[PDB]
Symmetry: C3
């Protein structure tokens, strides 16, 4: 599974770690994160994220 | 996947569109929507919805 | 699927019933409950739960 980066602040979503404190369990692919989730550091929406190739 | 209608207000849940602003991604079957979700237009619970055959 | 117990208060999570009022549908294995969920009776985190063997 691929990492994704917040293109506003630089935060990296790592699927192995998830974002458990906001309800995103380890092993969740980015696409499957609920679409109302926001960057945990800066607060912007998922549409500001991009895949890290 | 089937559409579902709110039998109180008439809203249509379309699985191809989801309800992303409330965390329901495109491609989510109605049954798999978390059971605390409510109609985005009128606020009633899932138990007021019915399958559109 | 296994039941899990809150080791603080004694609540039992039964996967057949879920916890629908908090968005956990029937049939959800404990591991797949979002990791920000808390015991519905006492409020402690998932890390205070244990599998009932
Ligand atoms: Zn950010
Ligand atoms: Zn409605
Ligand atoms: Zn408890």
């Amino acid at each position: 599974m691929k990492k994704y980066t917040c293109t506003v602040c630089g935060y990296i979503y790592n699927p192995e770690d998830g974002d458990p404190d906001n309800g995103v369990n380890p092993g969740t692919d980015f696409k499957d994160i609920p679409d109302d989730w926001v960057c945990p550091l800066c607060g912007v929406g998922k549409d500001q994220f991009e895949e890290v190739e």
